[PDB]
Structures are given as structure tokens and as C-alpha cells.
Amino acid sequence: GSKFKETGVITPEEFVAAGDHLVHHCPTWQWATGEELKVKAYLPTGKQFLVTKNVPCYKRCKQMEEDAILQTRTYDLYITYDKYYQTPRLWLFGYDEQRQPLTVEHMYEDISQDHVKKTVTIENHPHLPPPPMCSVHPCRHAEVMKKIIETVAEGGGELGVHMYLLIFLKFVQAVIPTIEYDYTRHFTM
């Protein structure tokens, strides 16, 4: 009784189970362990969070010259489990062309400013080392989430919570619609 559609809550076993499907559907997703010493007892070391990287973007998500942009970089995604909220979580960390980390303010350029303030936040990884990366806050605004969740009701995708990560990524695209990463890119509907 995940109730992911009713209340939007999943168990750690289901969450970790979901990654198997995500990685299978797209090889870009990989289960990662993170720091061995920071591993969770109730969470399998072999599978603590998903991650996909080296995903470039062709443009930013702001308002500049019609041909301003002219630089390509890469971003890194991560997917952890929040026991408190009991739902899938996603981080966000990028780098410049010189293989150097971007400042928090610069990182925001490739994200909706109206969202970075509330919809998103900056936090340190619970099992990964510094510097700090951007962490999304699920359940914040159920109004927009109801749309992404409503996807399951579309009538395609069975009632398997193992696909929650794929449904979740679609939501994230709305926070980073300028990054061309793999996540089904909408199916049918």
C-alpha cells in the first residue's frame, strides 16, 4: 500500500526497488553507494542513491540575447531517499567548462529563480562529501506535483511504484527544462 498516488509516500525498499527499473529503462541512471561510513543501516549500501552525469545543456533558463549563450557544460543528478518525508529526493550539482564548480548564484542561472527560492534549496549531501549541492524539497507545493503524479492515472504505467523515479524526474524537468538529461521525455501523453 504505497499510496504514492493517494498520499505520495514510498518505503525505502520500494524506492531502492524503483532504481532498478530506472537504470534498466535508461542506462544513464546508476545506483550509487556514496561514502561507506555515511551509509544508512536501513538503506542498502549497494543502492543508496541514483546518479547520472556528464549531461550538457545548450542554453540557460533566463533572459538574454537571442544568441547570447555560446558555452556548453555538464551537470550531475543524484536521487536520495528522505525518510522523514518518505518520498524520492533529487539533488543538482554542476561545473564550468574548466572543470571547476560554479558559485551558488551562478548555478541558479540555469534554474527558475522563482523556484530556487522556495521550490529548491542548497544543502550538503547526507552520504556524499562537499561542496554542497542543490537539494529539491518534495511535497512543498502539491498543486504542481498533482499534475506530474496525475501522470500515473493517465492509464499507462500500471500501478507499480517502481516507476516513481521516472515520474519524479518529469517534475524535475520543470525546475531544469534547459538540461537535456534522460528521463523518458514524456510518454504518449
Contact 154, 189 (CB under 8 A): yes
Q: What is the full DSSP assignment across the chain? A: ---TTTT----HHHHHHHHHHHHHH-TT-EEE---GGG--TTS-GGGSEEEEEEEE-SS-SS---TT------EEEEEEEEETTTTEEEEEEEEE-TTS-BPPHHHHGGGS-HHHHTTTEEEE--SSSPSSPEEEE-TTS-HHHHHHHHHHHHTS-STT-GGGHHHHHHHHHHTT-TT----STT----
Q: 131 preceded by cis ω (within 30°)?
A: yes
| Technique used by the depositors | NMR
Q: What angle do CA 182, 186, 189 make, to 5 degrees?
A: 170
Q: Which domains does the chain have, with CATH numbers?
A: 12-175 (3.30.1460.50)
- Tell which residue, 187, 182, 186, has the closest CA to residue 56: 182
- Among the options 26, 57, 134, 139, which is catalytic? 139
CA distance 115 to 90: 14
CA distance 31 to 46: 7
- Tell which residue, 137, 127, 59, 55, has the closest CA to residue 91: 137
CA distance 55 to 38: 27
Query: First and final CA of the chain: distance in angstroms?
Result: 26
CA distances from 61 to 12, 58, 111, 137 (A): 34, 10, 6, 20
- Tell which residue, 118, 66, 120, has the closest CA to residue 93: 120
Contact 15, 31 (CB under 8 A): no
- 139 catalytic, yes or no? yes
- Tell which residue, 153, 182, 180, 178, has the closest CA to residue 165: 182
CA distance 79 to 32: 9
By DSSP bridging, strand 49-56 and strand 30-32 are antiparallel
